[PDB]
């Protein structure tokens, strides 16, 4: 089977992970299931009779993504040393974060349109491999008209022909989750551009 | 016996691929081809597609939890050769996982309210309320945070309850706009506003 479990559970009762149902299981009370791992007794808790496993705390995926997982009368082991995947599933709950709070850049005065100024980057602590939670899109908030930024790549280019020293510009770039669709989390950075003479 | 796997998918999937939902499976299966899995119920056959050989369920459409949060389907497992069940036909649930795609909406659009003129600081005026269609079970996509956008020095709002209070110690009408926003303490998310009129008694 597969044992996922949604992160950041906000409620007050235990979280059902799933049950270990052996093909060796007879049907009656012939067997009992045993815990195997770190947290397996307080964090994860097992129903001895059935193999039902439940979690006991609210879990943050970003803090730990993955977890490592006999007869009632005799105790004779009919199963091998167990190990399953308890991978905490992902929700979008981390803001995109730029790699630098202030990017300092310069661009030649007599510059053609599309002239590279500086490239900005935002990491995203969420799962880039499930949903759009970490698909970040870059947009310009201040400095607009004079400069452009590539939605996907975060490359800032000059977007104006007639540009001579106003020597200085302050550009604000937004990064946003969910391929930029409304509802996504966002971060900003400021870019100080001086025109080189 | 049916293996008690879970069945889910994210809402509002923006990819031309079909989403994997889960695997129906039983003890009696032998990785053999001897079993035929059958899927019936609301959606089966067009909304939800099953591999009869492995028991893999896929979803075809982009779904919306706020429209419909859980689906009840029926699972069967029959012998190919004999045509007989190896498992009893059972209902099972497909859960639709949430994305933050609903704004907090205030109960009223205009909250007309009143409070005495000579009132002390922190005198309760009115409690505004916003609700959020998203899922309160996981994260903050549906936990709203109240904040004041207009009505400064004059008035205050309680962050988690939406109670408006007098913020002064010393005009008759006051236009106060309260904002509600999910994903508190985080930039982004979704927000809603409301106008609250305050007239002082004289
Ligand atoms: Ca988290
Ligand atoms: Ca994110
Ligand atoms: Ca996360
Ligand atoms: Ca929705
Ligand atoms: Ca939603
Ligand atoms: Ca929401």
Q: Looking at chain A, which residues constitute the CATH 2.60.40.60 domain(s)?
A: 1-91, 92-197
Residue A120 Cα distances to A145, A166, B92, angstroms:
18, 23, 47
Token pair listed for A41: 């007794």
Distance in angstroms (rounded) separating the CA atoms of residues A191 and A193: 6
**Which residues surround the ion ligand 2 when the cut-off is CB under 5 Å?**
A 92, 94, 124, 126, 133, 177
**A129/B contact by beta carbon, under 8 A:** no
CA neighbor of A28 nearest in space, from A47, A46, A49: A49
| β-pairing verdict for A85-89 and A3-6 | parallel
Residues on chain A touching B6 (C-beta within 8 angstroms): 4, 18
The dotted CATH code for B100-202 is: 2.60.40.60
Residue A144's φ and ψ, nearest 5 degrees, are -30, -95
Based on the number of CB atoms within 10 Å of its own CB, is A59 exposed (0-12), middle (13-18) or buried (19 or more)?
A: buried
Token pair listed for A184: 């996504």
Contacts of B40-49 spanning 24+ positions with Cβ under 8 A? B40/B73, B40/B74, B40/B76, B41/B71, B41/B72, B41/B73, B41/B74, B41/B91, B42/B71, B42/B72, B42/B73, B43/B71, B43/B73, B44/B73, B44/B74, B47/B71, B48/B21, B48/B73, B48/B94, B49/B18
Q: Looking at chain B, which residues constitute the CATH 2.60.40.60 domain(s)?
A: 1-99, 100-202
Residues on chain A touching B17 (C-beta within 8 angstroms): none
Q: What is the dihedral of CA B179, A131, B96, A176, to 10 degrees?
A: 10
Token pair listed for A70: 């006999």
Q: What is the number of other CB atoms lying within 10 angstroms of the CB of residue A166? A: 8
In which order are the strands placed within the sheet that holds A102-108? A102-108, A186-196, A168-176, A137-142
Among chain B residues, CA nearest to A26: B1
Q: How many residues does chain B have?
A: 202
Protein fold of A92-197: Immunoglobulin-like (2.60.40)
Q: What is the number of other CB atoms lying within 10 angstroms of the CB of residue A151? A: 15
Min distance A94 CA to chain B CA atoms (Å): 8
Rg (Cα) of chain A, in Å, rounded? 27
Token pair listed for A26: 């007879």
Q: What is the number of other CB atoms lying within 10 angstroms of the CB of residue B103? A: 20
Q: How far is CA A102 from the centre of its chain?
A: 24
Experimental method: X-ray
**A131/B contact by beta carbon, under 8 A:** yes
Distance in angstroms (rounded) separating the CA atoms of residues A173 and A188: 6
In which order are the strands placed within the sheet that holds A85-89? A3-6, A85-89, A66-68
Residue A82 Cα distances to A26, A78, B11, B26, angstroms:
19, 11, 34, 20
Burial B54-78 (b: 16+ CB within 10 A, else e): ebbbebeeebebeeeeebebebbbb
Protein fold of A1-91: Immunoglobulin-like (2.60.40)
Cβ atoms of residues B4 and B90 within 8 Å: no
Cβ atoms of residues B21 and B5 within 8 Å: no
CA neighbor of A170 nearest in space, from A96, A101, A104, A99: A104
Q: What is the number of other CB atoms lying within 10 angstroms of the CB of residue A145? A: 8
Protein fold of B1-99: Immunoglobulin-like (2.60.40)
Which helix H or strand E contains B187, and what residues bound it?
A: none
Q: Would you give the end-to-end CA distance of chain B in angstroms?
A: 75
Token pair listed for B56: 């893999």
Angle at A110 between CA A105 and CA A115, to 5 degrees: 50
């Amino acid at each position: 089977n597969q044992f996922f479990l949604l992160e950041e559970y906000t409620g007050s009762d235990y979280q059902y992970v799933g049950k270990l149902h052996s093909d060796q299981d007879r049907g009656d009370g012939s067997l009992k299931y045993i815990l195997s791992g770190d947290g397996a007794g307080d964090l994860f808790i097992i129903n001895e009779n059935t193999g039902d496993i439940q979690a006991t705390k609210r879990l943050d995926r970003e803090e730990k993504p993955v977890y490592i997982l006999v007869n009632r009368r005799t105790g004779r082991p009919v199963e091998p040393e167990s190990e399953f995947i308890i991978k905490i599933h992902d929700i979008n709950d981390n803001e995109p974060i730029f790699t630098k709070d202030v990017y300092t850049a310069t661009v030649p005065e007599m510059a053609d349109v599309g002239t590279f100024v500086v490239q900005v980057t935002a990491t995203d602590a969420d799962d880039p491999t499930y949903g759009n939670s970490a698909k970040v899109v870059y947009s310009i908030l201040q400095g607009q008209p004079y400069f452009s930024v590539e939605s996907e790549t975060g490359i800032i280019k000059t977007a104006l022909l007639n540009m001579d020293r106003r020597e200085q510009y302050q550009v604000v770039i937004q990064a946003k989750d969910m391929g930029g669709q409304m509802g996504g989390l966002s971060g900003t950075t400021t870019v100080n551009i001086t025109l080189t003479d």
